[PDB]
Design a protein around this ligand. Structure first.
Ligand SMILES: C[S@@+](CC[C@H](N)C(=O)[O-])C[C@H]1O[C@@H](n2cnc3c(N)ncnc32)[C@H](O)[C@@H]1O
Ligand SMILES: C[S@@+](CC[C@H](N)C(=O)[O-])C[C@H]1O[C@@H](n2cnc3c(N)ncnc32)[C@H](O)[C@@H]1O
Ligand SMILES: Nc1nc2c(c(=O)[nH]1)N[C@@H](C(=O)O)CN2
Ligand SMILES: Nc1nc2c(c(=O)[nH]1)N[C@@H](C(=O)O)CN2
Ligand code: SF4
Ligand code: SF4
Ligand SMILES: [Mn+2]
Ligand SMILES: [Mn+2]
Ligand SMILES: [Mn+2]
Ligand SMILES: [Mn+2]
Lengths: 209, 209
């Protein structure tokens, strides 16, 4: 049984796959923040820009089983077109994403990517694993496809992240009152340490979902 | 002997390698346009956003041999740092880029990328080949790493491009009086034909070289 905030079709705005068309499956609930504004100031993750509370969003609800969720996802894809790609996000998707859902998606010709905070173990049958480490949470996922670190955070040990087993290392400017400031920092960080790449939140520049 | 407009260190703003730190070596001169505004109206490629006329730009000039150019390129890279990466562009870089320069760059630990219009045969020892087909020009390069097509151009057979031997198929909005309009078009194209991914000129949004 799966609780989902919203499901929509658009372009991936972040990371190495930015610009790629995908269906976004936004699971509800996160392990690092309740999602209520009253708890934000005391949460483990405090900079979230997302509403993952409830199942009242576009195409969002409580789903019977795997097949029922896949039917909604596959129905948003353009008819007759291939290159099927779903991004599982939230919220923290590893609170709900299980092997039978992964298998049902693979069966429906989808490649599966995940946006996860790294605090939970992940299914390695997932095709694209994106980890965004929170500085005050434990990091148990130390291998994957891209490590997308939102900067700046306090207690952040940025250089240590580059010793982990990932293909791509990205820093992403923290959105908020200082997005312009943080963007210049991220750019500077990459030019000083070219192992890193800049991940822009392009969907906020294109004004698309 | 190489005629170079400008050499500068920044982030690659376009394509699959967007956000990646790179030295740009912008070669002077193109075969699809003289470079002067008087000729733009009757040139083969008529939408260029770049100045590639002359050798007066930053770190520009005429270079005695390959070793002199490599020295200037390597001197812009952060000291004691690896992941060396140069983007050869222009201008049409395949007018001047040859095997000695390619070998000298590799010997200096640089991975080589090229931005080329596809009208001239490329050196297949180049590590990243980006081809941007011009609709009214011949296309003699039909295999490479990424195919980055600027849309809309007239006489453009867009879907035909998808059947060429490339790894990534990107559409990039034509900048000009209709950038916002062309961006809407590009997004819509990718969502209709998800084999294609969106390529933004992110450096114009970050306001960086
Ligand atoms: C909303 S999270 C959902 C997935 C999971 N909870 C995680 O943190 O990876 C999706 C992505 O957006 C990033 N993100 C969230 N709030 C952000 C902010 N204010 N600025 C920049 N990126 C942010 C997260 O770091 C993560 O990479
Ligand atoms: C200036 S060209 C130099 C390399 C080569 N002459 C070519 O056209 O690929 C660099 C890149 O910028 C793109 N470009 C040039 N003018 C543009 C414009 N007005 N809008 C968007 N992209 C543009 C080209 O298509 C190419 O991919
Ligand atoms: N288009 C788009 N891409 C995204 C986001 C988002 O809100 N929109 N936010 C992040 C997410 O929800 O995983 C990362 N990628
Ligand atoms: N940062 C940056 N990246 C670029 C461009 C440019 O002008 N700046 N223009 C294009 C180029 O000159 O190759 C593509 N990539
Ligand atoms: S872990 Fe991810 S989903 Fe949870 S609050 Fe932080 S950014 Fe938002
Ligand atoms: S081929 Fe490239 S460099 Fe030449 S005019 Fe066209 S966009 Fe500019
Ligand atoms: Mn988001
Ligand atoms: Mn909301
Ligand atoms: Mn340019
Ligand atoms: Mn100029």
């Amino acid at each position: 049984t799966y609780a989902v905030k919203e499901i929509f079709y658009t372009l991936q705005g972040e990371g190495a796959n930015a610009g790629r068309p995908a269906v976004f499956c936004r699971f509800a609930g996160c392990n690092l923040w309740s999602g209520r504004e009253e708890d934000r100031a005391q949460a483990v993750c405090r900079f979230c820009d997302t509403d993952f509370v409830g199942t009242d969003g576009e195409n969002g609800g409580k789903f019977k089983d795997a097949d029922a969720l896949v039917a909604t996802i596959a129905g948003l894809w353009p008819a007759g077109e291939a290159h099927r790609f779903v991004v599982c996000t939230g919220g923290e998707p590893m609170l709900q994403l299980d092997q039978p859902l992964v298998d049902a998606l693979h069966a429906a010709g989808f490649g599966i990517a995940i946006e996860t905070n790294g605090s939970l173990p992940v299914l390695e049958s997932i095709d694209w694993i994106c980890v965004s480490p929170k500085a005050d949470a434990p990091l148990v996922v130390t291998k994957g496809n891209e490590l997308k670190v939102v900067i700046p955070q306090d207690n952040q040990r940025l250089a240590d992240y580059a010793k982990l087993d990932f293909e791509y290392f990205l820093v992403q400017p923290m959105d908020g009152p200082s997005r312009d400031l943080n963007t210049k920092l991220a750019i500077d960080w990459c030019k000083r340490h070219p192992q890193w790449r800049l991940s822009m939140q392009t969907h906020k520049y294109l004004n698309i979902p």
